[PDB]
Amino acid sequence: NNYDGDTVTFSPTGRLFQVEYALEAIKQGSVTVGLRSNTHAVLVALKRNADELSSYQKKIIKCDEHMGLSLAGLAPDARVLSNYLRQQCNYSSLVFNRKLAVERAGHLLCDKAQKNTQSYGGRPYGVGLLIIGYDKSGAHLLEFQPSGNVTELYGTAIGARSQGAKTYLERTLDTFIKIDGNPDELIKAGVEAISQSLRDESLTVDNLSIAIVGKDTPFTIYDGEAVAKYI
Amino acid sequence: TTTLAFRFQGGIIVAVDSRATAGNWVASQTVKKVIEINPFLLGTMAGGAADCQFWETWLGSQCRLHELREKERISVAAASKILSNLVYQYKGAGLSMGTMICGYTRKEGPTIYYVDSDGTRLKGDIFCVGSGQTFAYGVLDSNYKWDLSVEDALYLGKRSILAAAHRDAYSGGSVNLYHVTEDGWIYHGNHDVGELFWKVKEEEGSFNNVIG
Amino acid sequence: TQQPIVTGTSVISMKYDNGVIIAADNLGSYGSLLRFNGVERLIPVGDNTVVGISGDISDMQHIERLLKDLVTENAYDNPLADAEEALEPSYIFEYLATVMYQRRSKMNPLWNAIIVAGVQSNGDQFLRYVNLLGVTYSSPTLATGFGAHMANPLLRKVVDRESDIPKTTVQVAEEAIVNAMRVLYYRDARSSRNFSLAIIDKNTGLTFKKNLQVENMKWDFAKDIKGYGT
Amino acid sequence: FNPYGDNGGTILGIAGEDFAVLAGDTRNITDYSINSRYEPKVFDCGDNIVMSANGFAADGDALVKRFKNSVKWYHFDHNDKKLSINSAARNIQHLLYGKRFFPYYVHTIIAGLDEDGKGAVYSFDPVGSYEREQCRAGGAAASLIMPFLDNQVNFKNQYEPGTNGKVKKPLKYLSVEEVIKLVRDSFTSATERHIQVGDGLEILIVTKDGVRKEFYELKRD
Amino acid sequence: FQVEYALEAVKRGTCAVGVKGKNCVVLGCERSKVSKIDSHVVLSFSGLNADSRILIEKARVEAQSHRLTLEDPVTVEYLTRYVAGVQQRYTRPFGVSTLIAGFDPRDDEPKLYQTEPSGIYSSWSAQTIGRNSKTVREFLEKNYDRKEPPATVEECVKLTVRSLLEVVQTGAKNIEITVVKPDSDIVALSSEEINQYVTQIEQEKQEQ
Amino acid sequence: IFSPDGHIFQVEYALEAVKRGTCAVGVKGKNCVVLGCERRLKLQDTRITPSKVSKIDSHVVLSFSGLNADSRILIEKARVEAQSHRLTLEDPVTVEYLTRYVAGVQQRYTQSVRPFGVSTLIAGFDPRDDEPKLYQTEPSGIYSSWSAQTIGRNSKTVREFLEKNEPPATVEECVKLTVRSLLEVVKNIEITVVKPDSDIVALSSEEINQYVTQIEQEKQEQ
Amino acid sequence: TTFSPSGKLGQIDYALTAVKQGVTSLGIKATNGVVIATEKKSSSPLAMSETLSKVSLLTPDIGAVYSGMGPDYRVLVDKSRKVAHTSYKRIYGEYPPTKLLVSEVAKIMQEATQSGGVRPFGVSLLIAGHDEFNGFSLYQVDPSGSYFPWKATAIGKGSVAAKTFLEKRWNDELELEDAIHIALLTLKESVEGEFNGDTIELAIIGDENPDLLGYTGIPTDKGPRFRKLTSQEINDRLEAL
Amino acid sequence: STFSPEGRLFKLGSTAIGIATKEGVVLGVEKRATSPLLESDSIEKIVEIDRHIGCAMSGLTADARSMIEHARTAAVTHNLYYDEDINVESLTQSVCDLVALLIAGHDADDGYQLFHAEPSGTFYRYNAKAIGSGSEGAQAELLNEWHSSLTLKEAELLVLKILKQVMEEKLDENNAQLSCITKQDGFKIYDNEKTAELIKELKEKEA
Amino acid sequence: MDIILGIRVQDSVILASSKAVTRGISVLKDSDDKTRQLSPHTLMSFAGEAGDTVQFAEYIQANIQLYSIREDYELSPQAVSSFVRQELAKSIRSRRPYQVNVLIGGYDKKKNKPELYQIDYLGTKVELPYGAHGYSGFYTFSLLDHHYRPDMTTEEGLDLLKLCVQELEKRMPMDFKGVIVKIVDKDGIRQVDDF
């Protein structure tokens, strides 16, 4: 239709087609799962390889010891958004010695992403991010979308076929939020959830990437040999 | 500081002291006063340590970009011109530099370009730079010959730096020698003045006024 | 600002076993003219922080406005701002120090010396000094202006090292502070009889005793002095 | 408006086989007044490096903050890899010379183990100009401290007895403990003869086992 | 298709030919397009001469600026790279292809290059640009030999004029020749010289 | 932007606008250069209406065809440059140099906005030489020397006449050839005589009438 | 504003059409003066037509009238005054001659004809003025920036009929009052509605008017040569007509 | 600058091939000189980015050359600011932060790497890769032949065999070109003599 | 400090400049050529501050060569001198003035006359028969006034230059290490081995 090609045009029904197609951009990407307990937050990602001879894309970006994120959709937009988040957290640390609260980071990314959806010439970010962190208020998990919407969550999954993972997370919500004093079972529940989104493929030491942050855990990414114990 | 570089039949001999001073306090006696731009190009820093070190390290990166783009080494004239233009554009800003750009190129032969804070750039066969330059000249001009042997040229540079180290308060430390050959530069080592002086007095019999 | 016109003289502070005590006189002097006597130079920024400022009074009011804006902007989109993720003394001091150093670097300095005193959420006392040049330091006792020379020895006699803080109770520290005010009033020509005192305690919060008087002055020995020499 | 000051501190870096030592007093000064007895100015910088920016305190804080930012960005980009001592030296050189015409009036020292596992000490002037040194004092009492360290650590002007000044005393390695003893005695002398030193001595030791901090009392008068 | 249309514009410019000998490089053009950029290097173009002016002036300014920034004059490689870089930057774009030829400072090896609206440049021993470049290039391929190169200025000028006369109507009034020689010994052949060589080749073309 | 097949739309349409403009004629002599224009209305003020031939400097003049509005911009650009050249160098501009500058200013507007719909003939003498000069320019930004040339709406006809009509010898033959080109293509003609030493003069209506009556007598003779 | 395939500037012709839709305006040169005339329409009987003057002073020696879009004329006029002062009088200490100011106004309107994001001005001007060197002048300036001097001319919806009438009436020996008479007759013949001193307005570039100079005691200064004829002055002539 | 309803944003060149091994990385390019007059030595389809990084390209179009200059500036400024050669993945990220590309090089962090930019600009590390019109046929052979114990000697003949299989003209030291990067030698280009003897080794294998 | 002299002869312009280069307490070089060939028949000699002299000389030479390349003819010595003056005068009010005095000696191949222009660091151009800059004019001008003639041949001009240079050697305190003499005439530029 004639309203699709520009970000600054409402449809006759009031829809922003150019942003909903950015959402389709995440729907193109592979699944990444996130979940939290009161003390630990976990990310689980199914990486992709262009060819049998090719290595996999790193889908987890570490901000620092208390925060990090994963990707779904256009990786370069993830680079841009992640470096902006790094700039904001670094500025907070230099100017206040203050750990940038995860909700503050989420809303900063919301504000930055909203700008592209209102001014002409800009393109909506075709990437959605799951952000986890641990601060003075406990473990956090956020869902970021191109439209700018940012949502705090117990758990979620974004990417292709993530609906099954989200269904499993909704079913087991009352369980994994109770997990206390140990990260192992939380990561196990995360890998069980992500396994719901696999077709003609299975979790393997090369596909899977796991990350975690919490009270006793600075942000660490497990991959390769380290993730073998969870697959 | 004392630094000297003179062309001769075997290439170029570059000699420098090591002392660095801040007022009367001798800050250090092991300052490397030769910046190694590339295996065939050699900078000789004097005056302000920070300015020379930083800007000749940057000149190294410019040289690297030059080989990467044009597949041939930056000429001594070109590198000295870049440095001269840069130092000129900061004239009056407080740069303190005295630099001899010594190098060897197939289409230039052995070449020395003197560059300093005030923007000058001089091609020449013999140069002495630093607070002790006059004392080094007194020996070089009285002993220099084009057809000196490599050993004799090295000894002449060592002795010329030794004279300035003896007579100049700001020019002691140790003598570092470089020989810029047809196929590159050769670092002929470090000589401590506290031993070179006595060795030279014994062998030459000079410094007869010095007790010992 | 290149020169201070109206100034507040001195601020002193010390940390005791459970918190920090800080005091400052209410006089802003226009040169040698004791012009304004109602100035308040202790700036509460919460139940856990109070900021003492010296030097140019106009720059002090600017800094107070900056602190008010900090408090205002911290509460934006911060549902927890009133109990956690609230502004600690450390955050206030770090922001102030960054601003002061930046102003210094631009050759447009705030002619103030600032003591940020408070207690962190973990209960640890916070007490740091920052001046126009951006120079910062911490100590069991801090003072500004003539306090750094007159008052600071008196406070150090009470808490000379970090080991003495738990030994120092509220009453001992308050007596030391009041005696330092009396001495500064005696010997500082820019000082005033009226001063404000603020106590931040990890248990009982911020107490802010305003318009206190210097008392127990000793003058009766002056009747025996008979001029220079004879 | 004079934008500079002098907070009267001293730092000392010594390197040898198996270790590197960076020591500095905790006294903080303004004119003839003691600002604080314990303000650390030698910092454990992570990555098995120790840093100090002695001199004008505000510029020291600013430069240290800038270097922390730069090393953290290096970690962001280069996949959280360990930063080498020479890379840190070049980073600090570029930080310092970035303000050539409005310098940081701080004499910086970074100490650590180089890529070969041998101790390394890099020292900077306010403009840049880093030189790797076996030992390098700095600050107010540099002139008092350093000659004695030359004499003891390098045996300058010392000759084997009976050789009538022809054979120098060989430069055998000092162990870490012996370097601590030399540092303590040198700082005791600097305290005793220099008014700006004597509150407290803090020493950071760098070795493959990691950074190790030791604190010693000084006269404090 | 903007650069494609620019190339179509190139296809309507007058033809220019270059030949490299052992000690000479000679440029020929149908009826001076061959213009001197620096004392030792020249530039020839085919296409919109209106758009060629900006390229020529930028090249000249860059050559002098290089001589001012570095003591050494520009090499033919450097000038060709700059021409390509500028010609990219306007991608309306310039509808012109170019040849760059000459000698490097204190050099002895003649250089010849070609540059394209794409910004592509490559070294050539002999090359043509313009409307009938295909026929002239085919003619050159069967008359030039890498393993038997021209030896003298006479051979170079003869080969250039013979290549141009393949399609040119009347050489004396319809071609021009410039000879570039080491150490800025560049010269342009006058009417009597070019006519001498043209008649020399004419005496042979009529015989077969 | 280029057209497919290598054309350029706006330059072609500016050429059309030039082709629909009033004519400008030029003839260069052995010792002088003569430019002629047909003025091509009963209430229009003849006393003060500007002549199409314009001075760019003391020694060089410009004549134009096409959009009159753009001619003013082009002329002021040329004048400013001609004076700036004397600001930087003592010597005044050469005719070649001036035609080159006007070609450049015309070109720059085609690649940068619309092209100038103007074409021009440039005539003059070098500052201390004496050879005649005549040059032409068009919207594309290209120039060439000429012995006698014309631009405008009658060009397709009068151009072959001038080709039909060894340069002329003396100023009488130059003005005669110009006026005969204007009259042979079908007395309201501007004639400007450009001579070294900056003598630039426009022939009066009575001088034009003298030449025109002589040439009509010759035409009657056949 | 770009060339069409036929070589015409596309949107300029539309500006000319807008001018043709404007009310009639006139200009006539006498040997000793210049007259510019125009009828002023009204939006309603309640509107104070005396508030707006279609004729306006550019310099004390130069005046302008227009046909077309009035707001465009107003902004072009204050632009013209600004350029006449800043660009010429600020430098040379004298007001620009009619030729120079006409050239600057033509440049102002031509910039819109050769610049994107702006439409051409929808007004044609008749700029009457006087000079010590060029003498009296009358110029018509079109939306395209093309300007030509006229002995007498008319613009607006009555252009052709007024022009054909002026061609009959104008002669080389008109005095200023004869020019005013001819202008009154021509504009009366073109006004379809009521015709009196309040619907018509006149201005003249004639002899010096020291009575309007506003001060005395300087023999060198001469006073404005431009002056509008008041409603009573025009009524006097229409009654004598 | 606009997404399609499917979430995506709105091959004919010459072939380049590369192999990565525990011992080194080898790159190869079809030259395909368009005329015997063209200076074959002037066809630089492989260029150095840094003393341990080289880039093989389908064609050195000016858009590629600007990217080469940006990558070279990134490497040189990294050396200037950090006194260390740029890591391959960091260089690829910097270029991405700025045509089919095979960025390949060596470092002590990840050893020997080869990178190929997918059409969306996302670099993927590869064990073996081919680009250009020959990639469609090359990929199957690369999948067949690569093994973890592949030696550099075998990798050279592998790349040469791919070139022979896909090229339009019989291999010689002029119409095709090789380059490799090694920990000790750095990035280097095989001279015509070495290419020639490798071609004769290929022929001997065929014999 | 520098010596730069110029004498305009009936046929040629004779430019002489000192060979010494002094920096502080020491003479660095004793064979420096303080001249640049602006064009085949135009020669410029400069004196002044160390970096400024050569930087301005090369900037002017590059600009003159660019102009000659663009217009495909040699600029007249008048035009070259006017450009140099405009560059000098334009600089004194800028942030970085050029403390450079220049003598431009050229042969106008169109007028077929030698031309000598003296331009000071402020930008004061003046055409002279004989010119000198700085203190070098304080000794030579009286001798040149005494002995100069318009009709001299280049050899009498060289004899007069010898007189001037040896007068400078006699009375003037500095050791300028001799002069390097170049003749500008119909045939171009050449250097005299020992005038």
PDB file of C-alpha atoms in Angstrom, chain H residues 145 153-158 160-161 164 197-207:
ATOM      1  CA  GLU H 145      38.023 -31.244   0.742  1.00  0.00           C
ATOM      2  CA  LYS H 153      50.998 -27.264   1.362  1.00  0.00           C
ATOM      3  CA  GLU H 154      47.751 -29.139   0.712  1.00  0.00           C
ATOM      4  CA  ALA H 155      45.673 -25.958   1.060  1.00  0.00           C
ATOM      5  CA  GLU H 156      47.659 -24.223  -1.687  1.00  0.00           C
ATOM      6  CA  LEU H 157      46.933 -27.070  -4.098  1.00  0.00           C
ATOM      7  CA  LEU H 158      43.297 -27.064  -2.956  1.00  0.00           C
ATOM      8  CA  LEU H 160      44.702 -23.875  -7.081  1.00  0.00           C
ATOM      9  CA  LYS H 161      42.455 -26.833  -7.922  1.00  0.00           C
ATOM     10  CA  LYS H 164      41.533 -24.604 -12.256  1.00  0.00           C
ATOM     11  CA  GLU H 197      56.154 -24.161  -9.507  1.00  0.00           C
ATOM     12  CA  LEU H 198      52.882 -24.678  -7.625  1.00  0.00           C
ATOM     13  CA  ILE H 199      51.081 -24.903 -10.987  1.00  0.00           C
ATOM     14  CA  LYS H 200      53.611 -27.519 -12.091  1.00  0.00           C
ATOM     15  CA  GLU H 201      52.968 -29.361  -8.817  1.00  0.00           C
ATOM     16  CA  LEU H 202      49.255 -29.277  -9.648  1.00  0.00           C
ATOM     17  CA  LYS H 203      50.029 -30.658 -13.114  1.00  0.00           C
ATOM     18  CA  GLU H 204      52.189 -33.402 -11.592  1.00  0.00           C
ATOM     19  CA  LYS H 205      49.287 -34.299  -9.304  1.00  0.00           C
ATOM     20  CA  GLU H 206      47.075 -34.440 -12.399  1.00  0.00           C
ATOM     21  CA  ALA H 207      49.663 -36.540 -14.258  1.00  0.00           C
TER      22      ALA H 207
END
